[PDB]
Amino acid sequence: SGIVPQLQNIVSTVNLGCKLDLKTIALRARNAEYNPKRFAAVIMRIREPRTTALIFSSGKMVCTGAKSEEQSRLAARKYARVVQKLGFPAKFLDFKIQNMVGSCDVKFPIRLEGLVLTHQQFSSYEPELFPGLIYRMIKPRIVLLIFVSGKVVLTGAKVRAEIYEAFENIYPILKGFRKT
Amino acid sequence: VRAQLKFFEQLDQIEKQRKDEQEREILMRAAKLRLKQKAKEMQQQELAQMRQRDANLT
Amino acid sequence: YQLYRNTTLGNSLQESLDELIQSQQITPQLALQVLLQFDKAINAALAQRVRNRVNFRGSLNTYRFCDNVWTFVLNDVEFREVTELIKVDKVKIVACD
């Protein structure tokens, strides 16, 4: 098909290789949130690429909000540079993308109830709880949100190829369950 | 005389510190009707944590 | 809260107390008692007397949240109080819970 899934979220992790004083980072660095009684991390945001990091005292850090791998690595490098400029000997060890979320549109309505009745070993659909169908694809291991409007959401990938393969797998089933 | 009264006030301050330490020792023996006492101790601990957060803020 | 000690009223009071300390006319403990009574009085006066509303709009430059305290820095801001606009190039906001 001519529909390409566009990336919307990438969640990655990295190890700075040193113990971190979160109070000093919270008081000295800009755009930071720290509330240890509720959540034990520094919550930092930067604008280019517009991303949000979770920084722990041990030195491992989570970066979310990026829409590409290079933006996620650049963002994590910038957060590591922010931590480095505050006096801490941060490193950049074992960077890895942990989660990928994309979305697309098939441009037709979909019979969700027929989809959950015919794919009971892969899907679940309860309209009153959540109006969308959840499809747990095994090859590749991707969880998809299929809606009645035709918008399709893909999550859980480690690489872009899993998102593309999952949408190419699920597209003919959705063509078979169009509303006409 | 007022120097002796101030030494008497220092002795009374030692006795009041001993009375506050005895109250804190009774509170620690309570830490060492049961549910209400435990809830009151938890509320006091939360108030102390809030005071520490305010002091660190200033 | 000692929060309103860094205002025009509060810093003017602190400067007057520091002057009276420098000329040895009062003790610093006495100035601390005056600051505590000022804290109580300004908390009561802000709580009971003023009942007006302000709005504002602008662009956020930086934010910080620590020790249950928010600290913002805004740029190109317009504070709207009813009978008129207030324009400011940069403003710093300190907020306790």
- Helix then strand count (H, E) for chain C reads 2, 3
8 Å CB contact of A30 and C62: yes
- Give the whole-angstrom CA distance, residue C38 versus residue C26: 17
The single-letter code of the amino acid at B25 is E
For residues C61 and C34, is the Cβ–Cβ distance under 8 A? no
Does C64 sit within 8 Å of A31, measured CB to CB? yes
Task: Name all domains of chain A by residue range, CATH numbers in brackets.
Answer: 1-11+98-179 (3.30.310.10), 12-97 (3.30.310.10)
The DSSP H or E segment spanning C22 is helix C8-22
Tokens of A100: 């990928």
The span from the CA of A7 to the CA of A158, in Å, is 12
Given an 8 Å threshold on Cβ–Cβ distance, is A35 in contact with C68? yes
* Residue type, position A133, single letter: L
> Resolution of the deposited coordinates, in angstroms?
7.5
**How would DSSP label each residue in chain A?**
----PEEEEEEEEEE-SS---HHHHHHHSSSEEEETTTEEEEEEEEETTEEEEEE-TTSEEEEEEESSHHHHHHHHHHHHHHHHHTT-----EEEEEEEEEEEEE-SS-B-HHHHHHH-TTTEE--TTT-SSEEEEETTTTEEEEE-TTSEEEEE--SSHHHHHHHHHHHHHHHHHTB--
Please report the sign of the dihedral spanned by the C-alpha atoms of residue A108, residue A113, residue A118, residue A120.
positive
Any chains having at least 3 CB pairs less than 8 A from chain A are C
For residues A89 and A16, give the distance between their C-alpha atoms in angstroms, rounded to a whole number.
8
Considering only alpha carbons, which residue of chain B is nearest residue C95?
Answer: B57
Give burial (CB, 10 Å; 0-12/13-18/19+) of C63. middle
Minimum distance, in Å, between the CA of residue C18 and any CA atom of chain B: 20
Q: Is C75 left (phi over 0), alpha (psi -120 to 50) or beta?
A: beta
Q: How many Cβ pairs closer than 8 A exist between chain B and C?
A: 14
Strands A151-155, C69-81: parallel, antiparallel or unpaired by DSSP? unpaired
Please report, for residues A26, A80, A147, the alpha-carbon distance to residue A86 in angstroms, rounded to integers and kept in the order given: 11, 10, 46
- Cα distance between residue C91 and residue C60, in whole Å: 10
A15 is in an annotated binding site: no
Q: Does C66 touch chain A (CB under 8 A)?
A: yes
B51 touches chain C (CB under 8 A): no
Are A64 and A41 in contact by the 8 Å Cβ rule? The answer is no
Element (H, E) at B25: helix B2-31
Q: Per the omega criterion (within 30 degrees of 0), is the bond before A109 cis?
A: no
DSSP state of C25: S
Residue A52: phi and psi, rounded to 5, are: -130, 130
How many Å is the Cα radius of gyration of chain C?
17
Element containing residue B8 per DSSP (H, E): helix B2-31
What would you report as the CA-atom Rg of chain B, rounded to the nearest whole angstrom? 17
Residues 6 or more apart from A64 whose CB is under 8 A from it?
A9, A10, A11, A51, A52, A53, A54
**What length does chain B have?**
58
A124 vs A135: CA distance, rounded Å? 7
